[PDB]
Every structure is written in C-alpha cells, then in structure tokens.
Amino acid sequence: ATIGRISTGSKSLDKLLGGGIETQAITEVFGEFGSGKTQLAHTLAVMVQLPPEEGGLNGSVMWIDTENTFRPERIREIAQNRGLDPDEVLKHIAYARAFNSNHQMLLVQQAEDMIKELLNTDRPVKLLIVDSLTSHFRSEYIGRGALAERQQKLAKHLADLHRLANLYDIAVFVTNQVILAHSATLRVYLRKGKGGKRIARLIDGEAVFSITEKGIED
C-alpha cells in the first residue's frame, strides 16, 4: 500500500517532515516536559480525521495514554476551531489508559482487533498514539542490568507497533520525555523557543510553530 501523510496543523512542521507524518512508520517526538509533545498528539488526532485534500486520511484514532494526559475537551476545542464537529471527532478516538508497561504492551496487541474491525469501514484506523511510550519503562526498569532489559522490552513493543503500522497502513506517533539506541523510523526533537514558540528538528533545518486554539499552527 502507498504511504499516507497526516498534516500536523503547522505548514512549517509539515515541510520539515516531508509532507506530514507518515503511515507505515513510527514517528517519535522527544523533548523536555512542556515541549508540546502531547499538544501535537492531540492535534494529530483531529487532523487525521480530515479528508485527504485537507491533510487528513478520513481516519479513526487509537490512543494509549500512560500519564492521564489525554484531554477530551482539548480534542473538542481543536476540532470545533478547525470546522469539525467536536463530538464526532471525539467519538472516533478509541482511548485506553495503560497501567504499567506490560499492560501497555498488551494494549498494542489488543488494538489489532479494532484495527481489523474498522479496516474496511469508511473511517479505518489511521493513527495510533502512545503517549508516553517510555514513562512506564523508565519507572519500572531501573538500576544495574536495567538498560539491557528495558531496551529489549522496548524493542519488542516497537516491533509490535511497526507491524501494525506496516500491515494496516497506520501512522504510529509516540512521545518520549527526555546514548541509547532507538528504533522509531523518524525522531523529532521538540523544544521551547522564544515568544512561546516550539521548535522542531529531525534527529539522525528547523520548523517553528505555536500552540493555539487550533492545536498547533505556524
């Protein structure tokens, strides 16, 4: 299947990404607390639901939340301010809280059931968010020997996510609060800049955007 692209809401960030976030890929955003990772996730969960000529994929969303940071009213606000029905947009987000890293891993396997169910509807899953990818792994796997164990478990979790992305033509978008290896297909470093702006750089030019009532935009 041909790759799809999802607009982030920011023309600057879209250009940095080569046209938006890609299906059949894991895009990781990483940066300090407050860099805007979760705001970008909320914006993408709306943008993907737009039709293709507006930067979406007519898609539904699955969201795995490890930090209780999903805000339904933020979805509704972004949707309404972009001309979309807030309740329809919210309804197309399947939401799950992951209680620990092992539950997080099961939830990704569980997501395949709904992905298959929706695959031939008019709104197949096109975006799978894991926010935060790493928080439970960081809290649970700590101390001597934890580097190898944590990286091996994360590698398996990421392999599961890569399979869903590649098999079902989904964009996987993950957040990471920040020498270690990584296996996301694209890594985007996010940081605060002047004037309330956020700055994004690809890891291994820079885009600049604001967090607004429309989610993010230039």
Side-chain angles (χ1 to χ4, degrees), residues 27 66 83 86 90 109 119 149 154 181 187-188 197 203:
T27 301
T66 70
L90 186 63
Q109 306 165 28
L119 192 65
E149 191 172 13
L154 271 170
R187 303 188 71 235
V188 183
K197 295 173 171 316
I203 301 304

Side-chain angles (χ1 to χ4, degrees), residues 67-105:
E67 302 187 308
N68 302 338
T69 48
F70 176 71
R71 289 297 181 274
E73 293 301 334
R74 182 58 164 154
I75 297 295
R76 296 183 75 257
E77 173 187 31
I78 294 167
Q80 176 105 49
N81 291 327
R82 290 180 176 269
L84 299 184
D85 183 276
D87 305 299
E88 282 295 304
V89 167
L90 186 63
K91 273 191 180 58
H92 288 99
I93 302 175
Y95 175 70
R97 289 183 166 176
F99 175 97
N100 64 27
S101 74
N102 289 318
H103 184 216
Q104 183 177 330
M105 292 182 71

